[PDB]
Design a protein around this ligand. Sequence first.
Ligand SMILES: *[C@@H]1O[C@H](CO[C@@H]2O[C@@H](C)[C@@H](O)[C@@H](O)[C@@H]2O)[C@@H](O[C@@H]2O[C@H](CO)[C@@H](O[C@@H]3O[C@H](CO)[C@@H](O)[C@H](O[C@H]4O[C@H](CO)[C@@H](O)[C@H](O)[C@@H]4O)[C@@H]3O)[C@H](O)[C@H]2NC(C)=O)[C@H](O[C@@H]2O[C@@H](C)[C@@H](O)[C@@H](O)[C@@H]2O)[C@H]1NC(C)=O
Ligand SMILES: *[C@@H]1O[C@H](CO[C@@H]2O[C@@H](C)[C@@H](O)[C@@H](O)[C@@H]2O)[C@@H](O[C@@H]2O[C@H](CO)[C@@H](O[C@@H]3O[C@H](CO)[C@@H](O)[C@H](O[C@H]4O[C@H](CO)[C@@H](O)[C@H](O)[C@@H]4O)[C@@H]3O)[C@H](O)[C@H]2NC(C)=O)[C@H](O[C@@H]2O[C@@H](C)[C@@H](O)[C@@H](O)[C@@H]2O)[C@H]1NC(C)=O
Ligand SMILES: *[C@@H]1O[C@H](CO[C@@H]2O[C@@H](C)[C@@H](O)[C@@H](O)[C@@H]2O)[C@@H](O[C@@H]2O[C@H](CO)[C@@H](O[C@@H]3O[C@H](CO)[C@@H](O)[C@H](O[C@H]4O[C@H](CO)[C@@H](O)[C@H](O)[C@@H]4O)[C@@H]3O)[C@H](O)[C@H]2NC(C)=O)[C@H](O[C@@H]2O[C@@H](C)[C@@H](O)[C@@H](O)[C@@H]2O)[C@H]1NC(C)=O
Ligand code: NAG
Ligand code: NAG
Ligand code: NAG
Ligand code: NAG
Ligand code: NAG
Ligand code: NAG
Lengths: 15, 15, 15, 160, 160, 160, 322, 322, 322
Amino acid sequence: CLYRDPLGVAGGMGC
Amino acid sequence: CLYRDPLGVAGGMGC
Amino acid sequence: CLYRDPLGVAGGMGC
Amino acid sequence: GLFGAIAGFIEGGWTGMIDGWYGYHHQNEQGSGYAADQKSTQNAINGITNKVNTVIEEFNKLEKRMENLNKKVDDGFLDIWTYNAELLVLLENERTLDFHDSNVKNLYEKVKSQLKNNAKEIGNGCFEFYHKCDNECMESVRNGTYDYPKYSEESKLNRE
Amino acid sequence: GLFGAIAGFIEGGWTGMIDGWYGYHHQNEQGSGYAADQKSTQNAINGITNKVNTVIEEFNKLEKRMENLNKKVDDGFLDIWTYNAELLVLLENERTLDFHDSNVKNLYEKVKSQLKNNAKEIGNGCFEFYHKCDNECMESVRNGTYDYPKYSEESKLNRE
Amino acid sequence: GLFGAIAGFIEGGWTGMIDGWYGYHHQNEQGSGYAADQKSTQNAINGITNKVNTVIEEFNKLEKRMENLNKKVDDGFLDIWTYNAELLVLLENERTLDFHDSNVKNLYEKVKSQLKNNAKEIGNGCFEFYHKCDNECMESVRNGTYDYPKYSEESKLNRE
Amino acid sequence: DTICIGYHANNSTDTVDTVLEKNVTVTHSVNLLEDSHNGKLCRLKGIAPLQLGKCNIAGWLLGNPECDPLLPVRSWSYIVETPNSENGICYPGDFIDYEELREQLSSVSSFERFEIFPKESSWPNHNTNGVTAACSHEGKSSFYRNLLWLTEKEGSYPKLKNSYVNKKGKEVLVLWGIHHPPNSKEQQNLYQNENAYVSVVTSNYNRRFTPEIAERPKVRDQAGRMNYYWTLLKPGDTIIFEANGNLIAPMYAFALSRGFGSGIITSNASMHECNTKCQTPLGAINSSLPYQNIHPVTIGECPKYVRSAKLRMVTGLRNIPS
Amino acid sequence: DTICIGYHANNSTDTVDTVLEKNVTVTHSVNLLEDSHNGKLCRLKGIAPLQLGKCNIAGWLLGNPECDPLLPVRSWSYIVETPNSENGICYPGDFIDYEELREQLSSVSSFERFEIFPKESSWPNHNTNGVTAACSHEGKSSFYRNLLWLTEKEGSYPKLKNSYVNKKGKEVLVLWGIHHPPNSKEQQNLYQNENAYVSVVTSNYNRRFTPEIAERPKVRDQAGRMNYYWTLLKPGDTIIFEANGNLIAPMYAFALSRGFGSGIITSNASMHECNTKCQTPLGAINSSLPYQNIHPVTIGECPKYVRSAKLRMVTGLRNIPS
Amino acid sequence: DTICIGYHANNSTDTVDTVLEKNVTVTHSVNLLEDSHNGKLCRLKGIAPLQLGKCNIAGWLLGNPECDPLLPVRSWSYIVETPNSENGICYPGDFIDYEELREQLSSVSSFERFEIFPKESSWPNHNTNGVTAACSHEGKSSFYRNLLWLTEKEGSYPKLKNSYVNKKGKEVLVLWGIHHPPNSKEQQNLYQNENAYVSVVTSNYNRRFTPEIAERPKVRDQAGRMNYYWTLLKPGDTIIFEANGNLIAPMYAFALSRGFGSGIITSNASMHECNTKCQTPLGAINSSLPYQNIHPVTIGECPKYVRSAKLRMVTGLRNIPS
Ligand SMILES: *[C@@H]1O[C@H](CO[C@@H]2O[C@@H](C)[C@@H](O)[C@@H](O)[C@@H]2O)[C@@H](O[C@@H]2O[C@H](CO)[C@@H](O[C@@H]3O[C@H](CO)[C@@H](O)[C@H](O[C@H]4O[C@H](CO)[C@@H](O)[C@H](O)[C@@H]4O)[C@@H]3O)[C@H](O)[C@H]2NC(C)=O)[C@H](O[C@@H]2O[C@@H](C)[C@@H](O)[C@@H](O)[C@@H]2O)[C@H]1NC(C)=O
Ligand SMILES: *[C@@H]1O[C@H](CO[C@@H]2O[C@@H](C)[C@@H](O)[C@@H](O)[C@@H]2O)[C@@H](O[C@@H]2O[C@H](CO)[C@@H](O[C@@H]3O[C@H](CO)[C@@H](O)[C@H](O[C@H]4O[C@H](CO)[C@@H](O)[C@H](O)[C@@H]4O)[C@@H]3O)[C@H](O)[C@H]2NC(C)=O)[C@H](O[C@@H]2O[C@@H](C)[C@@H](O)[C@@H](O)[C@@H]2O)[C@H]1NC(C)=O
Ligand SMILES: *[C@@H]1O[C@H](CO[C@@H]2O[C@@H](C)[C@@H](O)[C@@H](O)[C@@H]2O)[C@@H](O[C@@H]2O[C@H](CO)[C@@H](O[C@@H]3O[C@H](CO)[C@@H](O)[C@H](O[C@H]4O[C@H](CO)[C@@H](O)[C@H](O)[C@@H]4O)[C@@H]3O)[C@H](O)[C@H]2NC(C)=O)[C@H](O[C@@H]2O[C@@H](C)[C@@H](O)[C@@H](O)[C@@H]2O)[C@H]1NC(C)=O
Ligand SMILES: *[C@@H]1O[C@H](CO)[C@@H](O)[C@H](O)[C@H]1NC(C)=O
Ligand SMILES: *[C@@H]1O[C@H](CO)[C@@H](O)[C@H](O)[C@H]1NC(C)=O
Ligand SMILES: *[C@@H]1O[C@H](CO)[C@@H](O)[C@H](O)[C@H]1NC(C)=O
Ligand SMILES: *[C@@H]1O[C@H](CO)[C@@H](O)[C@H](O)[C@H]1NC(C)=O
Ligand SMILES: *[C@@H]1O[C@H](CO)[C@@H](O)[C@H](O)[C@H]1NC(C)=O
Ligand SMILES: *[C@@H]1O[C@H](CO)[C@@H](O)[C@H](O)[C@H]1NC(C)=O
């Protein structure tokens, strides 16, 4: 709910 | 007028 | 006489 | 690692920092907690995204020589592409881990450069302030707007 | 960048430094100006030159299988060389930018290491002397022959 | 080099340090000598070992077209594998030298971070203590267990 | 008061390899290798493959009677032979330039099967009812559906000549056969003329054939043989057949339409009502990732085959929870 | 007093790509890709190519009359066919092993065209004046300049035998033809003997030919055909021709000199008085850079063809003026 | 009191190249390139190669008399021809599909040479003692050991027919010849029948041969020729020979065993009692390193051939002693 990650190279970030 | 640059990988250096 | 170097990528280390 | 921070002078990671890749933990009289550095995390996501996208873009019985030439071609191309795929992934994995290490190191140095001698550098990624640093002060550190002159006198007295 | 200097703690470049790739800007009572570090610039030109030089070194109607094998060979080699060319240039471009970043970082640290606490480190690439530093003093910094004991007493008085 | 230490702020190597790749030279009242850092040397040997292991894993007169296709295939594969072999070795050699540079830089920074202002940083890889540092003290520095509070008062008096 | 700099850890067990270190646990990674298939034959762009079943390409194109269910299929996305693709040439002999014919069919996405020479009007003064037990059907002797066995009539095999002009606007595949009897007695009983000849000519094809009488080790109860021949008749061109014996005449021919991206695979997998962009002989595979290790033979828009067991790129960090 | 460390910026708009970032503006970069050509055919090492113009390799080597301007050209740096290279075999038929002959010519840098069998001394008791309207010139029937149509004389075609010993010190390309008339009447009118034969033998070549009489769909007003054959006669060896009909005899042959770095290209470009190290069918290109995206077919010392639209290496810095 | 951080130096003169710098002196490095050989032909897995010596594959398999020392060799790790491999076809002619035969032998690791047709029981009413000076031995006219020259007996060459059933459980290589005399007189003196024929058939092979009488430029004192043919008779199948002239009959044939990792090389090196995992035509090479620059032709478990003169990876440090 914090980052633009269209490929999903990072996780859900807790949200 | 400062460097040995035989390939011209840098510019004219102002001279 | 100091390291595990099974390929011998380092020298004898003086021992 | 190449830049000395991850699994280096910052010995381990934070399961408690859930909202980004790099960031901060603070403690003051008002309490404690983790906060991601959102700018560096987003920049790293952008770079790793670009990296991933870059990576993801018969014969009859008297024709044995031609059959074997066809097999040589197929086998040779397969050898080359297996090599290329495996090597690119090994090299890029090394570079990705070093990129993260660099990002942590650079964030650490940015804080160090803001604080100067208004804090003591422990050597494990942490700084202990020579002045009281409340939540607005902490946020100024995290946002790159820390005001060293504001706290220099209190800090010099405590540093003594 | 990996080493934190270019587009990092030194936020931008100098159009006024026309005579090299890395260097100095100074201000003292005698005036101001830009000067390239010629040694680091020449060394970098040498390395980039070596890098560039390293990079720059029919069938009839009943023979369709042989025609298609020939096409497979040509197409496969073309695929491989297009891949090799594009990937080498991407990888080497990343490394070149990181090389420049490193060169700037190393020059900054060399100045920092000469000056010690005879100057205050601002954090944007600049140092503010605790002593008057005239043109000969500035040149000694640029040439790596700065004399810390000569100025330590004046600086300690001003640092107070 | 990329990390500034080897052939950088530590200008040369030590033929006298025979028992490892990176380490220490000390001088105190009890004497002097070289000692490898065995942990960093062993870790580097492990990494370089993994790197090396990764690298080390007829036609008749009316068939000239087929002969030339066979030659094209053989020549093209040879061109590709000669290129791959030479390029991988150049790239990995660059990375190996930078790895060693990083290892030296990280060891230097670990000592710097232990000693803080209990020693003066000369800038050539050396630290001059503001307190007497006997053999047990030196070993604590080499082993990462240096006790800054133990010597801080003596050092502050001498640093004055 | 304190502030610390640090980095993310989690409960990921993903591992990746680097050049300096193997099996590094990381917080997030991406698989680059398609390593599973669905075990089915699927449609490509909504078009089903041609399943030859128990027939091979020869049995299909000659019309071996056991291949009758294939006769009306006119378009396909790829051609599938099975390990059981046995029904082919039922009368033994050599299929000349068979591998080139298969190569040609590998770029055909549809055709029109049509009568090039109607049975009862094309060959007057010859019998057209020849069958053989080597090509049986319903326990009765039969013959290729696309060819016609011409034999003597009333003790005579007069010289024949007929032609076909390609007005299809497309290449026409024409197949025919030549019979080589085991002995001179069968030659004369069937074709009367001992020194018989066949001539097949187009503008860019010409070949003469002779009886080549010879007793061979028996295959499928036949001491004689039948050789099979083909050519591609270009639009506007004419094919001419001339013979006084031994011709196994064309009856049906094929107007060919060419397409890109077809092929011939051998597979033990079954057809299902599934859709894919990439088909292998083991099953369909996804096409999103750059590499696959399922099979080197693929049809469609496919990842590149590699031998690798694992290809995984780290995206997150070295994972050091504590 | 202050001193600052910094880096160069300028007004460069050059952009490069990296792995982490696209379109980075940099102070200096180098193009690695040749991406233009000059639109001309040029000389290589001062030697002009052989422009076949409206002829193909067959028309040139057989001497199709419409190719007479090519006859005296003896050396070339490469061979250029046009999309208009139409004049080839003017009497219709098959050129046997034509693609292999082209492959052989692709490494020939010069030859000597010479009389292997002088017209009026080599074939006594035969006519040597046969021409055809299919090979017309000046609106008059003519024939290949390098071959000779032997026909009966005074109602007779006696058996002929002649030989040539290669004393050139080089391989000699020998071409000949065999005529296949449409019907037996033309066979007897031209060559008398209905069961005629031709024999061509060297030490390492031997082939017998027969009339193969057959009526074909007409090409260029001819129901008959002429097949064309060749061999390379090695130094010191002898070629022997024997015939009682149908031989289209060699008259001129070619002593071949081999070279490296030649080839055959098809091109619509025109010759100019230019010089290059690297020729493509679109035009000449420079050779200094490692890669080129103009055309996969090249002659000379050339960059490697790639599909890339851009290949640009940064040499200077990330450019951040301000 | 002082403590300093530093790094190892030594007296190494090893140099390596990087991308930014050439000829960097380093404390330790590893050679990746095998760049020497031992100058010998060696065994692979304890098995010696077959050294054809002065014979080529044709002379060996036909049994040219000058190749008699090769006759009992039954297994080998690879096949070695020399620049002196001259003894092959001693009676001149064409060896049909010779290159395919060599390709077949390249995967044969052993065979059994056996009598397919015993000399004195297989061909009654024909002479079997034909020899020729073109295949001499001990200064006496001789003949291939594995073939048999059948000629007329008592002024007659009756039609012959014989067959062999492959009960070897392995493919059997069968070789035979066809004689083409220079003139009709020799044809009748040897085989009586001017219009002779030979037929060779298996289940999946069939070919008819004729005398093809013709006077050729003499090779090895022969105006006539002998062509050589072969086929692989699969287990359980039968080969049938039928003839009324010109057949050079099989006498010995070869039951073939296939293996992986064999090949044919040409070499001037001598055999020694050495062992290797990797053989080249220049000599044996080690197999521990990933690359080699000795020779592109290798047999065994070998490094990859590259053109490189040097491939050396640094393991230690930039070496800066002082
Ligand atoms: C591994 O860790 C996961 C979390 O890490 C994130 O996801 C991973 C994949 C990676 O991307 C990391 O970088 C990320 O940070 C676990 O998944 C989470 O599990 C927790 C359960 O503890 C979920 O949470 C709950 O969500 C409920 C609905 O919103 C809340 O009501 C609930 O609140 C109660 O419980 C908490 C204590 O957890 C109290 O503090 C509260 O006061 C209240 O009582 C929780 O907040 C969360 O949604 C999950 N996140 C994701 C992305 O799935 C994962 O745990 C496993 O998976 C989940 C789905 C369940 O099946 C768990 O039972 C299971 O263990 C970890 N896996 C393992 C094997 O441990
Ligand atoms: C882009 O910048 C160029 C300069 O940067 C260098 O070259 C680029 C390619 C790159 O390598 C950089 O790293 C380099 O630093 C511009 O080219 C220069 O233009 C200036 C004009 O302002 C030229 O200068 C003049 O030279 C005259 C002859 O020596 C002098 O007489 C003159 O002095 C007068 O003007 C100056 C102010 O400029 C006063 O201070 C003086 O007192 C006196 O009145 C100038 O010194 C210089 O020679 C050019 N250098 C090069 C290498 O070409 C370039 O400008 C464009 O190109 C030049 C050639 C002209 O056509 C300009 O009109 C034009 O704008 C810049 N390009 C753009 C698009 O802005
Ligand atoms: C290059 O340096 C080598 C040592 O460096 C190590 O090996 C190299 C390859 C590299 O891996 C480095 O990283 C390593 O550190 C030299 O080899 C050494 O030579 C010395 C001789 O000076 C040997 O030592 C002697 O060993 C004897 C038996 O143990 C001792 O009795 C002797 O003690 C006497 O001498 C010393 C002074 O040397 C006194 O202090 C003593 O009190 C006592 O009088 C020595 O200790 C050592 O064993 C060698 N090490 C190796 C690994 O070979 C090498 O020298 C060359 O090689 C040796 C074998 C001899 O042939 C030397 O004569 C010769 O010069 C160097 N090479 C060159 C060309 O200089
Ligand atoms: C990595 O892990 C896999 C599976 O756990 C194992 O097979 C392999 O041996 C490991 N490799 C190393 C170097 O530990
Ligand atoms: C293809 O991807 C989808 C998810 O997009 C998945 O459900 C499916 O199982 C995949 N197919 C195979 C054969 O793995
Ligand atoms: C880079 O620039 C080109 C041309 O300006 C443009 O076509 C392309 O979309 C740009 N790419 C990105 C990632 O901005
Ligand atoms: C080749 O390079 C020269 C400069 O050296 C240039 O003038 C010429 O236009 C180039 N040719 C082409 C076809 O680009
Ligand atoms: C490197 O050394 C070799 C041999 O000493 C020499 O031939 C070569 O020119 C050197 N290269 C450079 C760039 O100095
Ligand atoms: C192979 O390696 C051994 C050492 O293991 C060495 O003695 C031998 O000379 C090498 N052979 C060649 C041909 O270099």
